[PDB]
């Protein structure tokens, strides 16, 4: 089945607040990115032959070029100011629970799971401790799972042969928390 | 502070469909319903903090419609392949028997941005208590999308997310069952 898609993305990149902004507009026709506008360059640049005509045409209109370069402030910085009031500071504390499983053959237990869900933003730290010593190896993770509704979830597992008397602790550090969250097992 | 605001828009033929939306660090801020000409916030609470004038987005789409025709003519026999999606199914949060939860059907890395998604419970289509997002942008040229199903956890039921896409031989079905 033949399909035709005119698709564009206008990406506003921020480094340390609106201290350094960079606008990057990308044009695609079906599966090919054919042209782009990098604010750090100041003008359109064809990515493939199919995008040359537009670079040639648009680049020769000083009035229009001036307008795009200004979007770094008229659009990027302008919108960041708005979003900095509710999206940048969004914080949702995670729900942390620990529980054992098998995974392998059976008898006893070999996997300790630290489940961290329903949190935001995405940067988070999950550590495992065995009687006070941080377990660096034997860690298996599902990775940062994005739910699509502005919340994340993840599992961080420790592979172990539990010896009665040993206390395991899952420690979670996250921006929404004033103090590390810990759960023992 | 590292952040990224992506504004994405497109027009697709022959389906004759357009889209205009904003993304913040990977999550949808809002999109414009083209037909109804209105702003739809991904999270209700967002509306009290900002606003958008939809007609501006509709104008942009009109320009994309026009440009697509130029692009078709400019490439001549530009038609090509497509990318089948990866599909995954997982629960929103920890599942506990009897406690209502939500199944998430994650459709990733595909194009064109068109799909047929069906939720199945014990092999039957479910159309109540379901929802979805529009076509979301990725770092590359492909799209991603989320479908949701509300459900009552049970040890004897099973679920499936059925996804059909032009890049697939036959419709794809990903399975999900509860486990304690």
């Amino acid at each position: 089945a033949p399909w035709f898609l005119e698709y564009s993305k206008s990406e506003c990149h921020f480094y340390n607040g609106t201290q350094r902004v960079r606008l990057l507009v990308r044009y695609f026709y079906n599966l090919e990115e054919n042209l782009r506008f990098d604010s750090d360059v100041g003008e359109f640049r064809a990515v493939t032959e199919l995008g040359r005509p537009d670079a040639e045409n648009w680049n020769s209109q000083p009035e229009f070029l001036e307008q795009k370069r200004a979007e770094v402030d008229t659009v990027c910085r302008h919108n960041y100011e708005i979003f900095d009031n509710f999206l940048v500071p969004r914080r949702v504390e995670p729900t942390v629970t620990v529980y054992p499983t098998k995974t392998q053959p059976l008898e006893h237990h070999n996997l300790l799971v630290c489940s961290v869900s329903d949190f935001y933003p995405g940067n988070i730290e999950v550590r495992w401790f065995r009687n006070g010593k941080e377990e660096k190896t034997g860690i298996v993770s599902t990775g940062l799972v994005r739910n699509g509704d502005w919340t994340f979830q993840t599992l961080v597992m420790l592979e172990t042969v539990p010896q009665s008397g040993e206390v395991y602790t899952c420690q979670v550090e996250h921006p929404s928390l004033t103090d590390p969250v810990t759960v023992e097992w | 502070e590292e952040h990224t605001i992506i504004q994405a828009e497109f027009y697709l033929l022959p389906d004759k469909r357009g889209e205009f939306m904003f993304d913040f660090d990977g999550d949808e801020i809002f999109h414009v319903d083209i037909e109804k000409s209105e702003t739809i916030w991904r999270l209700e609470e967002f509306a009290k903090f900002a606003s958008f004038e939809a007609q501006g987005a509709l104008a942009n789409i009109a320009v994309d419609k026009a440009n697509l025709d130029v692009m078709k003519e400019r490439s001549n026999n530009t038609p090509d392949a497509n990318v089948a999606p990866e599909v995954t199914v997982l629960s929103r949060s920890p599942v506990n028997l009897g406690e209502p939860n939500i199944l998430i059907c994650f459709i990733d890395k595909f194009s064109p941005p068109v799909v047929n998604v069906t939720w199945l419970r014990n092999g039957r289509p479910v159309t109540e208590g379901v929802s979805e997002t529009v076509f979301l942008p990725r770092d590359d040229h492909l799209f991603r999308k989320f479908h949701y199903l509300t459900f009552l956890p049970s040890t004897d039921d099973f679920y499936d997310c059925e996804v059909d896409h032009w890049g697939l031989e036959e419709p794809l079905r990903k399975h999900w069952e509860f486990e304690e």
Binding site: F64, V75, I82 | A47
Partner: peptide, 13 residues
């Protein structure tokens, strides 16, 4: 509720 700006779309030939 401040107004979100959007980049303007350009026309091709």
């Amino acid at each position: 509720a401040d107004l979100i700006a959007y980049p303007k779309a350009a026309t091709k030939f």
